[PDB]
Design a protein around this ligand. Structure first.
Ligand SMILES: CCCCCCCCCCCCCCCCCC(=O)OC[C@H](COP(=O)([O-])OCC[N+](C)(C)C)OC(=O)CCCCCCCCCCCCCCCCC
Ligand SMILES: CCCCCCCCCCCCCCCCCC(=O)OC[C@H](COP(=O)([O-])OCC[N+](C)(C)C)OC(=O)CCCCCCCCCCCCCCCCC
Ligand SMILES: CCCCCCCCCCCCCCCCCC(=O)OC[C@H](COP(=O)([O-])OCC[N+](C)(C)C)OC(=O)CCCCCCCCCCCCCCCCC
Ligand SMILES: CCCCCCCCCCCCCCCCCC(=O)OC[C@H](COP(=O)(O)OCCN)OC(=O)CCCCCCCCCCCCCCCCC
Ligand SMILES: CCCCCCCCCCCCCCCCCC(=O)OC[C@H](COP(=O)(O)OCCN)OC(=O)CCCCCCCCCCCCCCCCC
Ligand SMILES: CCCCCCCCCCCCCCCCCC(=O)OC[C@H](COP(=O)(O)OCCN)OC(=O)CCCCCCCCCCCCCCCCC
Ligand SMILES: CCCCCCCCCCCCCCCCCC(=O)OC[C@H](COP(=O)(O)OCCN)OC(=O)CCCCCCCCCCCCCCCCC
Ligand SMILES: CCCCCCCCCCCCCCCCCC(=O)OC[C@H](COP(=O)(O)OCCN)OC(=O)CCCCCCCCCCCCCCCCC
Ligand SMILES: CCCCCCCCCCCCO[C@@H]1O[C@H](CO)[C@@H](O[C@H]2O[C@H](CO)[C@@H](O)[C@H](O)[C@H]2O)[C@H](O)[C@H]1O
Ligand code: SF4
Ligand code: SF4
Ligand code: SF4
Lengths: 70, 156, 318, 360, 182, 176, 106, 97
């Protein structure tokens, strides 16, 4: 019956699902649980470089808030 | 962890792949080709065994000779056989291909395709039923399953 | 970490291609009132594995190639480019976030025609080369509409960034404002990938289509994998382009599930179409492109340049 | 792209059938006719049987004649499914082949239930048919025929209005009426060009003048009109089969003259005369009075005929087989002029060529 | 064998050439590597190869010949050649570029050893090189092909048959120089 | 009587011209063809599960040959050679002589199954139902020589298949 | 760096698959077989489809900046020149069409 | 509710073959998990089933013995294993087993 085609489709579906799921999870693993920063234009890259300096640990995804104000 | 064991299991793997993925080149010469087409048709669906219906001679693993082989045609059949990549097998389908059949005594007919190519399975009938041909294909699968290429290599 | 990401893209791609071969045979089987592979593994789930092993231990074909370097380069180019087409795709996040990702995909696909040309050159056969040239002429012809159609849709998106297509379709699928472009886009992808009813490389009108003809070729498996990776990729691109999935930043997996289903369904429609129609003649598919799609695509490009301006709906640049 | 010359080289299935027949008795030669147009087996048998019955100056009984028309039209369905769907399969439309070959598989069962063979039945013989229909067969033929026109409609849904199919067939291989006649075409190769000819109507045999059907006629003489004619001929065959089922008479199924048709096995084992006639018919065979006939029928592929020469003995002196596909293929060069390579595949399909009959 | 089965027919052929030979095909496949080594320079080695069909006919004629029982035959070709000329001719028929270069046995034994490591038919081995560079014995006390009614086939008449497949894609050919007959 | 298959002139009013334009541009008749293949996808396939399931046959089926006996075990064949005379393929070779007890019996009965066309003429001609074509069709072999049946092979087939052969004869002999 | 690594990985794997696709069959050690510029003639039509593709493809290069061009203040000028380019692309097709540059009959 | 009745039948087939181990045995030997009425068993261990609701051609089937004449036929089955008495029934040459 036609539903015996589904097992092969399910295998295809899992294979196509993995790259998208992996990229999202690896991005959050590598950027402190947040989305990887998007820098398409120099202004965005300029702020990312500034964050890397401001962090004090050389990672742009380490955010400093009002605790650094004084 | 003997070499006999590993060679034995590797034989089973390659034998399994080769028999589970048999791509035929059907040489539809005459009436028997019709029954071959009924083996691909829905009732028997040869494709469900892993036997693709229409495969090019460049990727084929088995040649099915389905019909009378005439003298004028014998050179072209041998040429296709010589161009088949290995491992290659030949199934002779029907009385004409098996031994000449109804036309055995003709001036223009090759008396069995096994004068031209080596034949692995002979399927009798005029024509063999689609089911008879399928039986013969499944017989070839079991013959491939019995192959011992790596065991023989290991004992050379 | 990035090296893991690459392998978590490449390996699943090769597995999807493997099992698409099984899905095609079973879907085509049931539309033909039969089953397709159901003996090698339960529901034929081992059939792709048996075919793969069988092909790689098969003897290489004869005759010898005319050019060894081009004989080896063609399959490398086909498969290398096929995998490269996947790296900017947002699912919902891309492996490589390009500002000009759409243009990158156009550029890389236009290079896929070289494997056809090189394999024809290395075939050592006059007739096989002529077959390759007809295939190239088909491919480049339909590249014209894909580029112009793509440009027309981006006038509603506002940039060449693939992930911006997601934002553009946050309210509504682009297929509604652009269904005429979607129709011609979808057919162009069929003709671009040499799929039925445009599969003349596998047809009956070629000088080399004769069964008893021979020329240097192969490996068959590598070319086959490259082709089917492009079928899936084009249908993934089609979904993103016209059937944009909503993205929730806190639940990216929901995007991926919904996005995967749409891509699968579009891919199944390629199989659906292959089961339904006869094959075009070479001159007739040229006529379809040059005398039907192209005049209408140029007109719709004019319309989609004008429409955002006259409705005050120009999209943002960033 | 253009074809300038088409030179078919045949003989690759020439098996010297005509020379072999001269060494067989008339019964022994009957199975050779199954293996000519091996898609229209029982129609080939009927043609040979009519020719022999004519030289013998005997006629088969009415029930045999209705059985021969019934299975003649079942055979036309077998042939047209093959002709149409392999024509479609060879230009890429593969799916109708599978749907309709399941229908062919069920008509193979009718062949097997009357003869014990799916294809080469050897069932129609000079004098009638070999055996009477098994009980329950006509009911199953009725059940098959009841649903078959729906199967034809599904085929038409795939092809008839399809623009791709029409592009591959319309105005391809146009044949004028005058050329069709002089090139020796027959069957649909004639009716596609508007010629109003059909041997069942004009020179009827068996009981074809007792059944009602219409001859489909084309208007453009191209591949598409010949495709429409074949599809419509399948509908007419169903219409004829419907009348054969209702009008099937009772009685014996082979001529009641034991110097031509063998006696019943029960008679052969009790009567001295029957045993002698059984012995002689299966060894020497019946003698055929000297003479020559050209006998033709409207086979599914066109006019199929035999020029049969008897020298007065039990073996034919000469048997020339007129295969309709022989003249049709001879016209391939004429028809392919001004067309492309892809069109030659369509033209060969529209001619409905089986090399069993072309090469003999 | 002569002690066990005294009436045995022993046939002692020279290197045999033919479609499936490992002689002409051996030299043709040396081209598959740029180097074309040769003990000395292919000199000091004289070869008298015999055609495969000639050996076959000789064997068959031996089965049918009552005289042949208990004898020892030597099957050799008609013409003796220098190993350098033969290989040069082989490359000329195969339309290949011929690049000779000298080597002694010690440097020719390591290449032989290096390919002996293969778990299949080696491309070459020390023993194969030693046999190739063994001069073909002249044994005039033994009967040959002519005693069995077989005419030895010249190599020049059959080289194309064997080496046509090795060509890359006027037939000057240049017949190889033959050592003066005894 | 005859009918035209293609002699309709299309109407040329707006309603009709625009219907044809919609078909051209909106691919409607192409979509219809997709509907038919989709409908088949949801139909049960016609495939049987060979070799666990078998295609139907009838008692008349012409398969592998066999030589039969009387209930006592005596051979039915009395070497009349009607089968050898009628065989269209000359597939039968027979020799005979008086048996030790004086009975008329064959010493050779060969069928070249690669000459045979499986026509069933031999079993029609046989006056004592000695030679028959049984129901077996699954006897393909790996060598050509295995298909050259001698009398021993054919008698073994009779003893092997008689249970089924007798029932099939019982079912069809009144049609003969 | 990442894009270079991705391209290197993709074409490295493609290369390995190709060489093992060419070496793995040599494990079988199959038997030896021992049994096997100028015009084409090339049709002018196949050359002219390639050239037409190129010239149309060059005009597409000029149209690619349209998404950015629509951000300008001089929209009237931009729209006039955008439609001008597409129209000349149509005029090229019309000229080819009406001189039978798109035919395949000889 | 029809979709749930289909799922019930699917799980009812698992019980019909004697549990998961029996269900997988038939699935891998015969690529078919239908449950039918047992019609009989021959002396070699072949089991014959019928289901008259199936369409003609699938209404009768045999599950081959796993060992016949000393041959292990767990995986290697063959249509020639059906003895003549059942051959007539399995090929529908007759109605009665
Ligand atoms: C996508 C391709 C990826 C690369 C290739 C695949 C990965 C590398 C190879 C490992 C994959 C193994 C695939 C599964 C093999 C099992 C096959 C099977 O289903 O058997 C059923 C078969 C079924 O038997 P059957 O085929 O006779 O059944 C006949 C059909 N019926 C039953 C319906 C009547 O069972 C067997 O007999 C076993 C056959 C041998 C299986 C191979 C054993 C060795 C495996 C280990 C090898 C070690 C080296 C690995 C490297
Ligand atoms: C990345 C995805 C790739 C897709 C998967 C690729 C397939 C992977 C799974 C299959 C791998 C099987 C490799 C063997 C290839 C087939 C070889 C074959 O068929 O045999 C023919 C040949 C037979 O050799 P032969 O010499 O005896 O016979 C040939 C006879 N003539 C010359 C006349 C033709 O096998 C071999 O040559 C040996 C191959 C070695 C296989 C490795 C064995 C290892 C175990 C032995 C050592 C023991 C200690 C451990
Ligand atoms: C080889 C066979 C065919 C495969 C070639 C694949 C394309 C080549 C790579 C070009 C990629 C590209 O342009 O993407 C732009 C992409 C996308 O551009 P973008 O502007 O979208 O993003 C860049 C980053 N922002 C936006 C923040 C400024 O550029 C990059 O991602 C950065 C590129 C870094 C520098 C790359 C140096 C190596 C270049 C090698 C080129 C190829 C060498 C020749 C190979 C042989 C001949 C083909
Ligand atoms: C279909 C009708 C139902 C609409 C639908 O697809 O479900 C939408 C659902 C989430 O909707 P979403 O797309 O994420 O948000 C829209 C805002 N951009 O998304 C989903 O549920 C996942 C998709 C499942 C439903 C399939 C929708 C895609 C169908 C594509 C069919 C392709 C047909 C190709 C036609 C040519 C072949 C004939
Ligand atoms: C208010 C209502 C407005 C709409 C009314 C439109 C009026 C009709 C427009 C013209 C219709 C077409 C004219 C024509 O006669 O077409 C037929 C012919 C093609 O026939 P053909 O197949 O080549 O014949 C060969 C023999 N078999 O045609 C030809 O041979 C040549 C046609 C070439 C056309 C190519 C055009 C390409 C550009 C597509 C349009 C994009 C916009 C172009 C710029 C226009 C801006 C206003
Ligand atoms: C308010 C005003 C706004 C302004 C914009 C208004 C625009 C709307 C009005 C225009 C409508 C445009 C329609 C777009 C489709 C293109 C139409 C077309 O070109 O099709 C015709 C083409 C040729 O047709 P033919 O009959 O052979 O010959 C005619 C020429 N002599 O024939 C074909 O192309 C047929 C297709 C060939 C391929 C067949 C195989 C595929 C069929 C299945 C596809 C299923 C649907 C796919 C949908 C995918 C969506 C993702
Ligand atoms: C692998 C299979 C996956 C599927 C899984 C199961 C779900 C099935 C969903 C598929 C739906 C399509 C299948 C049904 C199609 C059959 C229906 C049909 O036959 O309609 C025919 C109809 C009449 O045609 P005709 O007779 O020629 O009339 C002409 C003048 N009235 O003709 C028509 O009216 C056609 C009307 C539509 C024309 C639209 C033209 C194309 C426009 C493209 C837009 C695509 C949008 C959808 C894409 C997917 C995104 C959701
Ligand atoms: C012919 C029909 C063309 C109609 C054009 C009418 C233009 C009316 C106009 O006023 O032009 C400016 C137009 C409207 O702006 P407006 O409100 O008038 O601003 C006034 C400030 N002075 O500005 C706009 O809003 C947009 C102007 C678009 C006009 C594009 C016209 C096409 C130009 C390309 C022609 C290509 C011809 C090439 C042919 C090649 C042949 C070999
Ligand atoms: C990890 C994955 C490794 C890669 C595994 C690749 C497995 C490939 C399995 C292919 C299964 C068979 O799939 C089927 O193959 C044949 C080719 O013979 C194709 O056949 C098609 O191409 C050939 C020419 O190439 C034509 O002669 C044929 O008429 C056409 O239909 C079918 O379109 C395809 O459906
Ligand atoms: S064996 Fe019989 S059916 Fe087959 S080709 Fe010969 S005559 Fe025709
Ligand atoms: S079936 Fe026909 S061909 Fe075969 S042995 Fe009997 S009579 Fe001869
Ligand atoms: S099998 Fe019958 S016909 Fe043949 S010789 Fe014996 S008794 Fe006579």
């Amino acid at each position: 019956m036609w539903f015996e085609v589904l097992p092969g489709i399910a295998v295809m579906g899992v294979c196509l699902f993995i790259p998208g799921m992996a990229t999202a999870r690896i991005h959050r693993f590598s950027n402190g649980g947040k989305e990887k920063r998007v820098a398409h234009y120099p202004y965005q890259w300029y702020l990312m470089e500034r964050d890397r300096r401001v962090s004090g640990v050389n990672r742009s995804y380490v955010s400093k808030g009002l605790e650094n104000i004084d | 962890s003997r070499g006999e064991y590993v060679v034995a299991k590797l034989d089973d793997l390659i034998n399994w792949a080769r028999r589970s993925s048999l791509w035929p080149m059907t040489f539809g010469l005459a009436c028997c080709a019709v029954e071959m087409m009924h083996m691909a048709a829905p009732r028997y669906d040869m494709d469900r065994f892993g036997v693709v219906f229409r495969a090019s001679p460049r990727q084929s693993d088995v040649m099915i000779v389905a019909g009378t082989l005439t003298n004028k045609m014998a050179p072209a059949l041998r040429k296709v056989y010589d161009q088949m990549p290995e491992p290659r097998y030949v199934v002779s389908m029907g009385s004409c291909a098996n031994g000449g059949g109804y036309y055995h005594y003709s001036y223009s007919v090759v008396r069995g395709c096994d004068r031209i190519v080596p034949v692995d399975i002979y399927v009798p009938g005029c024509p063999p039923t689609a089911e008879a041909l399928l039986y013969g294909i499944l017989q070839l699968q079991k013959k491939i399953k019995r192959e011992k290429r790596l065991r023989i290599w290991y004992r050379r | 970490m990035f090296m893991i990401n690459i392998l978590m893209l490449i390996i699943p791609i090769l597995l999807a291609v493997a099992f698409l071969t099984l899905v095609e045979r079973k879907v085509l089987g049931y539309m033909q009132l039969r089953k397709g592979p159901n003996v090698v593994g339960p529901y034929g789930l081992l059939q792709p594995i048996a075919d793969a092993i069988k092909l790689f231990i098969k003897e290489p074909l004869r005759p010898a190639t005319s050019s060894a370097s081009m004989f080896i380069l063609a399959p490398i180019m086909a498969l290398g480019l096929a995998l490269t087409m996947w790296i900017p795709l947002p699912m919902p996040y891309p492996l490589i976030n390009m500002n000009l990702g759409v243009l990158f995909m156009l550029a890389m696909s236009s290079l896929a025609v070289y494997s056809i040309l090189w394999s024809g050159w290395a075939s050592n056969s006059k007739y096989a080369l002529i077959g390759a040239l007809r295939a190239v002429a088909q491919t480049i012809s339909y590249e014209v509409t894909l580029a112009i159609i793509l440009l027309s849709v981006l006038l509603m998106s506002g940039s060449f960034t693939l992930s911006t297509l997601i934002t553009t379709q946050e309210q509504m699928w682009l297929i509604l404002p652009a269904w005429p472009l979607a129709m011609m886009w979808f057919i162009s992808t069929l003709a671009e990938t040499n799929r039925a009813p445009f599969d003349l490389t596998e047809g009956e009108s070629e000088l080399v289509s004769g069964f008893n003809v021979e020329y240097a070729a192969g490996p068959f498996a590598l070319f086959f994998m490259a082709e089917y990776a492009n079928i899936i990729m084009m249908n993934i691109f089609t979904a993103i382009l016209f059937l944009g999935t909503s993205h929730n930043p806190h639940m990216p997996e929901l995007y991926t599930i919904n996005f995967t289903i749409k891509s699968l369904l579009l891919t199944m429609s390629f199989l659906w179409i292959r089961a339904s129609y006869p094959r075009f003649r070479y001159d007739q598919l040229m006529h379809l492109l040059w005398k039907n799609f192209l005049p209408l695509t140029l007109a719709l490009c004019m319309w989609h340049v004008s429409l955002p301006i006259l409705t005050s709906g120009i999209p943002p640049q960033t | 792209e253009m074809v300038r010359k088409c030179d078919p080289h045949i003989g690759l299935l020439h098996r010297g059938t005509e020379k072999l027949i001269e060494y067989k008795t008339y019964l022994q030669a009957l199975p050779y006719f199954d293996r000519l147009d091996y898609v229209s087996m029982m129609c080939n048998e009927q043609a040979y049987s009519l020719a022999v019955e004519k030289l013998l100056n005997i006629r088969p009984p009415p029930r045999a004649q209705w059985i021969r028309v019934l299975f003649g039209e079942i055979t036309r369905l077998l042939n047209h499914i093959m002709a149409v769907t392999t024509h479609a399969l060879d230009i890429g439309a593969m799916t109708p082949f599978f749907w309709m070959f399941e229908e062919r598989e069920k008509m193979f069962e009718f062949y097997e239930r009357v003869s014990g063979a799916r294809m080469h039945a050897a069932y129609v013989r000079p004098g009638g048919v070999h055996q009477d229909l098994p009980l329950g067969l006509m009911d199953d033929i009725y059940e098959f025929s009841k649903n078959f026109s729906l199967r034809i409609d599904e085929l038409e849904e795939m092809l008839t209005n399809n623009r791709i199919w029409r592009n591959r067939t319309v105005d391809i291989g146009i044949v004028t009426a005058e050329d069709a006649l002089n090139y020796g075409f027959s069957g649909v190769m004639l009716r596609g060009s508007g010629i109003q000819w059909d041997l069942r109507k004009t020179q009827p045999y068996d009981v074809y003048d007792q059944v009602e059907f219409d001859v489909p006629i084309g208007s453009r003489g191209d591949c598409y009109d010949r495709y429409l004619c074949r599809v419509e001929e399948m509908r007419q065959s169903i219409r004829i089969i419907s009348q054969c089922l209702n009008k099937m008479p009772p009685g014996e199924i082979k001529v009641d003259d034991a110097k031509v048709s063998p006696p019943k096995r029960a008679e052969m084992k009790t009567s001295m005369e029957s045993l002698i006639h059984h012995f002689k018919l299966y060894t020497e065979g019946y003698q055929v009075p000297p003479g020559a006939t050209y006998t033709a029928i409207e086979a599914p592929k066109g006019e199929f005929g035999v020029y049969l020469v008897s020298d007065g003995s039990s073996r034919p002196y000469r048997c020339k087989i007129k295969a309709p596909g022989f003249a049709h293929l001879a016209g391939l060069d004429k028809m392919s002029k001004g067309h492309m390579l892809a069109d030659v595949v369509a033209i060969i399909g529209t001619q409905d060529i089986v090399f069993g009959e072309v090469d003999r | 064998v002569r002690e066990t089965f005294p009436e045995a027919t022993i046939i002692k052929p020279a290197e045999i050439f033919g479609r499936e030979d490992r002689f002409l095909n051996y030299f043709a496949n040396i081209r598959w590597f740029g180097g074309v080594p040769l003990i000395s320079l292919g000199k000091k080695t004289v070869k008298q190869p015999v055609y495969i069909v000639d050996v076959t006919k000789g064997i068959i004629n031996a089965i049918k010949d009552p005289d042949a029982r208990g004898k020892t035959f030597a099957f050799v070709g008609p013409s003796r050649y220098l190993l350098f000329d033969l290989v040069q001719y082989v490359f000329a028929v195969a339309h290949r570029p011929f690049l000779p270069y000298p080597l002694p046995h010690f440097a020719y034994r390591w290449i032989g050893r290096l390919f002996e490591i293969s778990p299949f038919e080696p491309w070459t081995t020390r023993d194969k090189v030693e046999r190739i560079h063994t001069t073909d014995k002249i044994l005039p006390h033994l009967p040959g092909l002519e005693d069995l009614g077989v005419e030895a086939t010249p190599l020049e008449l059959k080289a194309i048959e064997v080496l046509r497949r090795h060509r890359t894609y006027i037939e000057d050919v240049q017949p190889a120089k033959t050592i003066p007959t005894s | 009587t005859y009918k035209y298959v293609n002699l309709r002139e299309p109407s040329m009013d707006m309603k009709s011209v625009t219907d044809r334009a919609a078909q051209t541009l909106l691919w409607t008749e192409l979509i219809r063809g997709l509907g038919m293949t989709l409908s088949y996808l949801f139909r049960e396939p016609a495939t049987i599960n060979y070799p666990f399931e078998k295609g139907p046959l009838s008692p008349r089926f012409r398969g592998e040959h066999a030589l039969r006996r009387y209930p006592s075990g005596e051979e039915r064949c009395i070497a009349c050679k009607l089968c050898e005379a009628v065989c269209p393929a000359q597939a039968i070779t027979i020799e005979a002589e008086p048996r030790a007890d004086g009975s008329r019996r064959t010493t050779r009965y060969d069928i070249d199954m690669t000459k045979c066309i499986y026509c069933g003429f031999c079993q029609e001609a046989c006056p004592v139902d000695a030679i028959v074509e049984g129901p077996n069709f699954e006897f393909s072999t790996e060598t050509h020589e295995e298909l050259l049946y001698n009398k021993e092979k054919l008698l073994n087939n009779g003893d092997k298949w008689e249970a089924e052969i007798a029932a099939n004869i019982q079912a069809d002999y009144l049609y003969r | 760096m990442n894009l270079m690594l991705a391209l290197l990985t993709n074409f490295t794997l493609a290369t390995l698959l190709v060489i093992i696709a060419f070496w793995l069959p040599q494990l079988n050690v199959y038997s030896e077989k021992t049994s096997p510029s100028a015009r084409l003639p090339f049709s002018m039509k196949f050359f002219l489809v390639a050239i037409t593709f190129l010239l149309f493809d060059l005009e597409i290069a000029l149209l690619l900046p349209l998404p950015w061009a629509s951000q300008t203040a001089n929209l009237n000028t931009m729209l006039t020149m955008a439609l001008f380019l597409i129209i000349l692309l149509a005029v090229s097709l019309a000229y080819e069409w009406t001189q039978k540059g798109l035919e395949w009959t000889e | 509710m029809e979709l749930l009745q289909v799922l019930k039948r699917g799980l009812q087939q698992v019980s019909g073959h004697g549990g998961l181990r029996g269900y997988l045995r038939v699935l891998f030997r015969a690529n078919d998990v239908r449950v039918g009425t047992l019609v009989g068993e021959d002396k070699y261990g072949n089991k014959y089933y019928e289901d008259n609701k199936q369409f003609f051609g699938r209404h009768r089937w045999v599950i081959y013995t796993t060992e016949m004449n000393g041959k292990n036929t767990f995986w290697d089955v063959d249509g020639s294993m059906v003895p003549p008495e059942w051959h007539r029934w399995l090929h529908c040459m007759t109605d009665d087993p």
